[PDB]
């Protein structure tokens, strides 16, 4: 955990995030939806629950990205919920929720669900 | 359960379904997305798990509606997952998943999530 989480992570589709896990449960960094460009870059913030593990459990964590920066304002936010598992092939497995700001007529269609796995390679 | 489930159910927004709970776990009927019109009417099918209850548990169930009939073909299907609770104020509390058929580029945005409660009144 902590030192294990700190670094660069990649998913299947070309997205990258960079995170520092801080001593008292903090997670901070940047999500880049495409590894090339300097603003597909958005702020991330989250938390993780550190614990003594004796049985090969994952570490529960979560983070939020709001989709606004100097180039784009998509009127939406995503949360990822999941766990870190370390080792030779460390991964973070997540499920996510994306909500867009709607009028109240459209509120029932505001939230998408999906899943993502991140690796160090 | 069974006799308890059989009948007409209403949600907050004006939708209605009519269901028969059959002796060996079957659920069949029609969902009408608006109580007025004779085809906002679509076929439903599902299952429920009947059990001896001694502690005031709900009955787990689920059903599917594909959104095609003689008037509309929306290229989508919804599944509702939840439980029936009986009594003076019997309700069915659900969460749902709506998936639309997409091209593979659009597959990550294919599924919405939400929730519904149904009552007899």
């Amino acid at each position: 955990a902590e030192a294990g989480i700190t670094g660069t992570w990649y998913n299947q589709l070309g997205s990258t995030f960079i995170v520092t896990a801080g001593a008292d449960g903090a997670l901070t960094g940047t999500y880049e939806s495409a590894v090339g460009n300097a603003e597909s870059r958005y702020v991330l913030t989250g938390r993780y629950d550190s614990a003594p593990a004796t049985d090969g459990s994952g570490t529960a964590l979560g983070w939020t990205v709001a989709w606004k920066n100097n180039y784009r304002n998509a009127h939406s936010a995503t949360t990822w919920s999941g766990q870190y598992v370390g080792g030779a092939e460390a991964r973070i497995n997540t499920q996510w929720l994306l909500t867009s700001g709607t009028t109240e007529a459209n509120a029932w269609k505001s939230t998408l669900v999906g899943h993502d796995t991140f690796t160090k390679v | 359960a069974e006799a308890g489930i059989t009948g007409t159910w209403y949600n907050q927004l004006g939708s209605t379904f009519i269901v028969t709970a059959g002796a060996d776990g079957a659920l069949t009927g029609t969902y009408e997305s608006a109580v007025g019109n004779a085809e906002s009417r679509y076929v439903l099918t599902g299952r429920y798990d009947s059990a001896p209850a001694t502690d005031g548990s709900g009955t787990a169930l689920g059903w599917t509606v594909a959104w095609k009939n003689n008037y509309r073909n929306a290229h989508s299907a919804t599944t509702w997952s939840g439980q029936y609770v009986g009594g003076a104020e019997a309700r069915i509390n659900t969460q749902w998943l709506l998936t639309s058929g997409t091209t593979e580029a659009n597959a990550w945005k294919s599924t919405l999530v939400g929730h519904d409660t149904f009552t007899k009144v």
Binding site: S33, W67, T78 | W108
Partner: peptide, 6 residues
Amino acid sequence: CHPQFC
């Protein structure tokens, strides 16, 4: 072309 993937 949402922010998340593009």
